[PDB]
């Protein structure tokens, strides 16, 4: 468990990997983004660029697929989405290595989660904040990656939350290349699966039941050819909920809960899958990180726990 | 210049002993936090804040990344 | 409050005392050196910060450290400090 210092002056809000697994990007509340690269020789993480990005605290970042280039979608609390492209003819650790592409100033509220779509949908973007409106951004013209169009606008909340009550949002796309477009939307105390129809407009397909408290993280297991999909959820309750979805609005889909695990006895802040959907990693309020793997049966059982 | 504030997250912690009336922070090194608390009887003790992991993402090479809610260093578990 | 002087517990010349705070929520074991009048002689050794609404307290002279603590709810917690 060797640590490395991110160098941020305040709390690191979100960290994600790239596709190749050799780059991480760290957003924080010191209005900065730092992208680290995994050194091949020394095997120690070192900084590549450290540039100020937004005017407020950045809370969610997500990489694009490398076939579309190196694009980072940063969402912050200042009602903006900022897209950053790497320009290779610039020295490292400068501050101009990642040239800005666009600002999506179509948000009336502070954002919480931004997630790029899978590659077979194109360069699609998903943005959710406390406005209760999900806006999908599309990069239609590949000649210039600076024009982004707003196509799907679905309202996930009746009213925006209060100024004092807390709210959390998490998005997760559907990595299935031979299934229609699906999106998981965790708005307060609602887990909604949004599916693309024949008319091209998203509809409420199914809702994951349970969820007596505030939802903190959602994650979709990578479909590797199995006939059932998996969605992992971590609530403000200590429930790591793994939902099983069978799909057969061209296609209807049924939601069945596979497990409900209470080994944290707190708030499950982040739950996330592996490359192949085998190992599930969850962190809770008890200061422990629990790895989960399926047994000979399909029921999930706890494995080695990192404290 | 005026920042319209709103609450993002609430982090809960249970005190070691009950019947506490007043408390105060203790600044620690590396953005740490301990709490000094005064009970209703007047006895004063020290309570630390646990380093709760905030994000557990998995790499394609089977590696675990760990960010903390307190400080800025990031923990790495490698498959080696 | 309740201050009880306990004998047959110290081999040396120091004298041991047991105390209950006026809030009836705490039990403290003291050692007091009588030959020095200053407040540094009042030494606080161990403290047991639990219970709530203590109503009685006693000690065992034959066996060292065994102290019984009553409660208003109805539990007689008998334990050892020394």
Header resolution in angstroms: 3.2
> Do C9 and C60 form a contact (C-beta atoms < 8 A)?
no
Encoded tokens for A20: 């190749």
Q: Give exposure, A39-78, as e/b (b: 16+ Cβ within 10 Å).
A: eeeeeebeebbbbebbeebbbbbbbbbeebebbbbbbbbe
B: neighbours with 3+ CB pairs under 8 Å? A, C
Which residue, among C75, C48, C55, C49, has the nearest Cα to B40 in the 3D structure? C49
Q: How far is CA A87 from the centre of its chain?
A: 25
Which residue, among A60, A77, A76, has the nearest Cα to A25 in the 3D structure? A60
> Do A102 and A146 form a contact (C-beta atoms < 8 A)?
yes
- DSSP structural state of residue B50: P
Rounded to whole angstroms, the Cα distance separating C5 from C11 reads 15
What Cα–Cα distance (Å) separates residue A77 from each residue in A59, A215, C20?
7, 19, 53
Which residues fall within 8 angstroms of residue B12, CB to CB, at 6 or more apart? A267, A285
Neighbours of B13 (CB within 10 A): 12
Which residues fall within 8 angstroms of residue A42, CB to CB, at 6 or more apart? none
> Do C78 and C68 form a contact (C-beta atoms < 8 A)?
yes
All residues of chain B having their beta carbon less than 8 Å from the beta carbon of residue C47 are 43
Rounded to whole angstroms, the Cα distance separating B19 from B57 reads 39
Which residue, among A96, A128, A97, A132, has the nearest Cα to A115 in the 3D structure? A128
Helix runs in A40-188, H state only: none
Rounded to whole angstroms, the Cα distance separating A176 from A196 reads 13
Angle (CA) A213 A306 A37, round 5° = 95
CB contact under 8 A, C49 and B40: no
Rounded to whole angstroms, the Cα distance separating B6 from A93 reads 34
Q: Which of residues 38-67 of C touch B (CB under 8 A)?
A: 47, 49-50, 52
Neighbours of B44 (CB within 10 A): 12
- A-B Cβ pairs (cutoff 8 Å, strict): 122
Which residue, among A207, A195, A188, has the nearest Cα to A257 in the 3D structure? A207
A: neighbours with 3+ CB pairs under 8 Å? B
Which residues fall within 8 angstroms of residue A2, CB to CB, at 6 or more apart? B75, B76, B78
Rounded to whole angstroms, the Cα distance separating A237 from A253 reads 26
CB contact under 8 A, A4 and B76: yes
Angle (CA) A270 A272 A275, round 5° = 160
Q: How far is CA C24 from the centre of its chain?
A: 13
For the residues of A96-123, what is the DSSP string, one character each? -SEEEEEE----SS-EEEEEEPPGGG-S
Q: Which CATH architecture has domain A12-247+252-307?
A: 7 Propeller (2.130)
What Cα–Cα distance (Å) separates residue A215 from each residue in A97, A188, A238, B56, C48?
36, 6, 11, 16, 40
Q: How far is CA A108 from the centre of its chain?
A: 21
All residues of chain A having their beta carbon less than 8 Å from the beta carbon of residue B64 are 281, 289, 306
Rounded to whole angstroms, the Cα distance separating A150 from C44 reads 71
Q: How far is CA A217 from the centre of its chain?
A: 8
Of A3, A59, A168, the CB nearest to B74: A3
Residue C39 phi/psi, 5° resolution? -70, -10
Tell whether A76 lies on the interface with B, counting CB pairs under 8 A. no
> Do A89 and A99 form a contact (C-beta atoms < 8 A)?
no
The residues pairing with A72 across neighbouring beta strands, listed in sequence order, are A63, A84
All residues of chain B having their beta carbon less than 8 Å from the beta carbon of residue C26 are 41, 43
Q: Where are the beta strands (DSSP E) in chain B?
A: 20-27, 33-39, 44-48, 53-58, 64-68, 73-77
> Do A285 and A267 form a contact (C-beta atoms < 8 A)?
yes
Rounded to whole angstroms, the Cα distance separating C56 from C69 reads 6
Rounded to whole angstroms, the Cα distance separating B76 from A3 reads 6
User: Helix %, strand %, coil % for chain B, to 5?
Assistant: 0, 45, 55
> Do A33 and A26 form a contact (C-beta atoms < 8 A)?
yes
Tell whether B15 lies on the interface with C, counting CB pairs under 8 A. no
Structural element, H or E, at residue C80: strand C77-80
> Do B32 and B25 form a contact (C-beta atoms < 8 A)?
no
Rounded to whole angstroms, the Cα distance separating A160 from A169 reads 12
All residues of chain A having their beta carbon less than 8 Å from the beta carbon of residue B14 are none
Tell whether B17 lies on the interface with C, counting CB pairs under 8 A. yes
Neighbours of C50 (CB within 10 A): 13
Rounded to whole angstroms, the Cα distance separating A77 from A60 reads 10
A147: three-class secondary structure by DSSP: coil
Rounded to whole angstroms, the Cα distance separating C72 from C52 reads 8
């Amino acid at each position: 468990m060797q640590p490395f210092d991110s160098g941020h002056d305040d709390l690191v809000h979100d960290v994600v990997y790239d596709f190749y697994g050799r780059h991480v990007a760290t957003c924080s509340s010191d209005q900065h983004i730092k992208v680290f690269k995994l050194d091949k020789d020394t095997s120690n993480w070192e900084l590549s660029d450290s540039w100020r990005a937004h005017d407020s605290s950045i809370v969610a970042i997500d990489w694009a697929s490398p076939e579309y280039g190196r694009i980072i979608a940063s969402a912050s609390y200042d009602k903006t989405v900022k897209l950053w492209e790497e320009d290779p003819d610039q020295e490292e650790c400068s501050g101009r290595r990642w040239n800005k592409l666009c600002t999506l100033n179509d948000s009336k509220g502070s954002l919480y989660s931004v997630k790029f779509a899978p590659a077979h949908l194109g360069l699609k973007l998903a943005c959710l904040g406390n406005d209760g409106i999900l806006r999908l951004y599309d990069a239609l013209e590949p000649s210039d990656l600076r024009s982004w169009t707003l196509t799907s606008e679905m309202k996930v909340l009746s009213i925006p939350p209060a100024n004092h009550l807390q709210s959390d949002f998490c998005l997760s796309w559907c990595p299935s290349r031979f299934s229609p477009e699906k999106l998981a939307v965790s708005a307060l105390e609602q887990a909604i699966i949004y599916q693309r129809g024949k008319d091209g407009k998203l509809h409420v397909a199914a809702k994951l039941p349970g969820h007596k408290s505030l939802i903190r993280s959602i994650s979709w297991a990578p479909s590797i050819g199995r006939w059932y999909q998996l969605i992992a959820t971590g609530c403000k309750d200590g429930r790591i909920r793994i939902f099983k979805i069978t799909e057969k609005l061209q296609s209807n889909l049924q939601v069945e809960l596979l497990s409900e695990h209470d080994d944290h006895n707190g708030e499950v802040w982040s739950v996330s899958w592996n490359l192949t959907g085998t190992i599930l990693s969850s962190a809770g309020d008890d200061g422990k990180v629990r790895l989960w793997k399926a047994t000979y049966s399909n029921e999930f059982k706890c494995m080695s726990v990192i404290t | 210049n005026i920042e319209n504030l709103f609450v993002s997250s609430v982090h809960d912690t249970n005190t070691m002993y009950d019947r506490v009336a007043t408390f105060d922070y203790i600044p620690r090194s590396n953005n740490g936090t301990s709490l000094i608390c005064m009970r209703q009887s007047g006895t004063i003790y020290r309570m630390p804040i646990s380093e709760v992991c905030s994000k557990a993402i998995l790499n394609n090479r089977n590696s675990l990344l760990l960010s903390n809610f307190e400080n800025t260093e990031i923990d790495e578990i490698r498959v080696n | 409050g309740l201050i009880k002087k306990v004998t047959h517990w110290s081999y040396d010349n120091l004298i041991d005392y047991l105390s209950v705070n006026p809030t009836r929520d705490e039990v403290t074991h003291y050692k007091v050196d009588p030959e020095n009048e200053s407040d540094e002689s009042i030494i606080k050794l161990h403290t047991v910060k639990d219970f709530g609404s203590i109503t009685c307290l006693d000690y065992s002279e034959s066996e060292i450290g065994m102290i019984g603590v009553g409660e208003k709810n109805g539990y007689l917690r008998i334990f050892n400090i020394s």
